[PDB]
Curated annotation (Swiss-Prot), chain C:
Organismal lineage: Archaea, Methanobacteriati, Methanobacteriota, Thermococci, Thermococcales
Pfam family, one: TrmB
Organism name: Pyrococcus furiosus (strain ATCC 43587 / DSM 3638 / JCM 8422 / Vc1)
Family, as annotated: Belongs to the transcriptional regulator TrmB family.
Cited function: Binds to the maltodextrin transport gene cluster (mdxE operon) promoter and to some other TGM (Thermococcales-Glycolytic-Motif) sequences, but not exclusively.
DNA-binding region per Swiss-Prot/TrEMBL record: 32-53
Matching PANTHER family: HTH-TYPE TRANSCRIPTIONAL REGULATOR TRMBL2
Name the record gives this protein: Putative HTH-type transcriptional regulator TrmBL2
Length: 261, 262, 253, 262
């Protein structure tokens, strides 16, 4: 039918509905004026000029300017052939455009991938309040740690996060536990001291240290103090996930750590 | 520079605005959740799930089974290349789709173009817009030329239809071709050229003539060349069937022909 | 009041409605959570987090990430000044960008003004059918002509479009009329014959020429029912002018 | 490239797609009617009138003497220039409008910020996103600093707050400023120099340090500098009021402070 001709033109040769209808009409009727097209095909009267003019510019028609414009269809074997050839040239050009878009993006995104160290998630600073949230944060750090754990403990930490601490030790995590000497005998029946003696974790003590902390693989979790927080009672703590901050707290742990035993 | 990365992704790798922004963000941050994407980029919050999900689909993002779904970028060199490879295969399918369509159209139109009847010949003047569309008419002139052919070509009139020019030559049609010197390079070696060397047509060249044309038996096709209209593919070209007018253009051709060299 | 504060923030400091309301709220209350904001101001509850976070990235707020997200206003005198300083610098870069865009446009559009082929955007080819339309197009040209008129007339043009021909002559237009001897005596009581002798126009005749035409300053109107073609182009017209000058030679009196 | 001309007009001279296209068309063809514009350009037929009329309003098009159906372009050199002149003045108009608005807001807020408590300040930790927003906090630190200032600045932390730094020095604040070497060209105006030259503060420079900071008495503001988070203006910065943390950063500052010369 003629319907199939309209579809094919619309689908593959970039004509809109009216343009496809008008071109088919031109093939069938030869010379048409916009007025005649109106009566010949299914194209709105105010569009018949607009449409035929488009087909002209698209290479599907030729014309005779005048008070009344006459239009002539370009033979299908020419315009359909020409289109595919012109189409193929656009394609080939675009391919090059994409590979140059490719290279330019690679150049532009090298700055985003060059820093091969700090690839943490967005959330790197997290403020923790209260006892419940505190132990929940400490649990996670212990759950996620895979390389090392450094703990300076004046808590309220070894008890009862013991079962999380030992679990990490059981996973081969290089554990070091430093705690206040005054709090030492609290662990006299702990699992930690057994692992300390067997021993897969090292444990030491110190009369009192000023800056307690938990370090877990490029993460540090420490508490602010000012100055009756303990047993009065309220907690304010800060979590940071960044090698550079951890390096500071790790250097300090190692200063506290070398107070052997 | 970020804006450029978004532009390039959007125009050439078929990402929309938010998809392009999100992909850059994934590359930059290494890993994002829909919540984190909302936080760092200009993708609206409720849109961030679908954006990351579509990037995954398109091959720009990578994730784990879930539901603990975090999204991470696939390295650009392994995506932009893969996109192009996919695009090329999509093209090849459309190309043949067009070939199939063309042939069905020609078969459907066969009853319309045969015994059409075609109603032209009585029309002795037509206008063709777009200098690049000239071969939609000059092809027909060469098909029906049976006495003589005079061609003064800038590259846009009738050269490139060599098979039709030569068929005319081979059926005894007298042919004179005048080229601009800028066509002497692109028209090597060639097929049209060796006909001139064999003496089957005459071929000469001239620095520049201001009025290109194709004359085919009491018919003339000529271009009103203008480089300001060239930008809008809207140069006026005219076909006239009138030996008196053709005579005018034929005299002028012969004037250029005198200046024309070897 | 705060209604005025919200208005000003939206109009000049590029906050949306909810953001302006939320910042004002922060100034008033110091520390707020998204939940607290919801109860304090007219910001939709589910929008309160997004808004506060937006203010965070926009420099209007500071925060404490947590289960309890706290937000703190940046002092008005700092963020409002900070905005204007940054705004003013963004502008100047754009200023430079506009002057660089201008320069590139002038270079790109040079081919559009350099290719000095001074024609109109109007079409240059016009097909005319029928006599009434023919005489109107002919009338038009004669009135449009400003330099010269060349007419080879075996019509039915000079008769009777005379008043348009002489009107052109009266305007100082260089008129030359060639007409067929066979219809020549029709003009023996015309104004054209008077103007030919006075003479403000040159007039000759010839019993037969093959290509009649009207030329009016790089415009030509000639005939192929009857179908006529008008062309507006220097190079094409030159051919028709060359032919006119061949027919032009010569005749009395 | 026509497309480039449309882009530039569209991006910088506030023309929409159809207006920008039409202007190029006017430039190319010299004079157009709405009908003529529709035919040559990609502006839809029914739109060519309002498009041309609006170009006239904007100063890009001119009506012709006589019957005004035809439009002619106003030459680019007299429009693109005139636009910039108008735009600059329009900008300036808004600049003063913003400053005025600022001034009104501050007086409106005076009951909240004048003789302020403030309700915040008891809080000993805050986070600032965007390294370029850091001076919204560090300014406050410099204002209240009365013991010492230790500044290791990559350019975005506090060095661009000269008025407050100088004021601090003038009240006896021990001030050490450490800059990256790429800031020395631009900071030779200046206040910090001559104060470094007069011996009122110490100024050293260093190729690069990994942890920018501002220490003011018992407070530290430090940046987790990270490109390409900067690309999305989302670098995480932290303010802590706690002499123990400050001490760590103070040790590290003194580490950066060594070797750095000039
Ligand atoms: Ca402030
Ligand atoms: Ca202040």
């Amino acid at each position: 039918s003629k319907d199939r001709m309209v579809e094919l033109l619309q689908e593959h040769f970039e004509l809109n509905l009216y343009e496809a209808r008008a071109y088919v009409a031109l093939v069938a009727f030869g010379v048409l004026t916009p007025a005649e097209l109106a009566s010949v095909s299914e194209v709105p009267a105010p569009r018949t000029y607009d449409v035929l003019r488009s087909l002209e510019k698209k290479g599907f028609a030729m014309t005779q300017p005048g008070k009344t414009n006459k239009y002539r269809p370009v033979h299908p074997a020419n315009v359909l052939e020409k289109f595919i050839q012109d189409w193929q040239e656009r394609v080939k050009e675009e391919l090059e455009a994409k590979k140059k878009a490719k290279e330019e993006l690679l150049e532009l995104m090298a700055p985003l991938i060059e820093t091969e160290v700090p690839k943490y998630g967005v959330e790197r600073v997290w403020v923790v309040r209260g006892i419940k949230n505190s132990t929940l944060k400490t649990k996670e750090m212990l759950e996620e740690a895979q390389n090392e754990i450094l703990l300076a403990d004046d808590g309220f930490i070894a008890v009862n996060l013991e079962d999380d601490i030992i679990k990490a030790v059981d996973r081969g995590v290089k554990t070091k536990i430093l705690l206040t000497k005054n709090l030492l005998p609290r662990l006299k029946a702990s699992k930690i001291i057994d692992y300390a003696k067997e021993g897969k974790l090292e444990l030491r003590a110190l009369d009192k240290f000023d800056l307690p902390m938990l370090i877990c693989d490029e993460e540090v979790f420490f508490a602010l103090e000012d100055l009756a927080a303990r047993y009065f009672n309220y907690e304010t703590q800060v979590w940071i996930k960044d090698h550079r901050v951890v390096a500071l707290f790790k250097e300090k742990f190692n200063e506290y750590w070398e107070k052997a035993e």
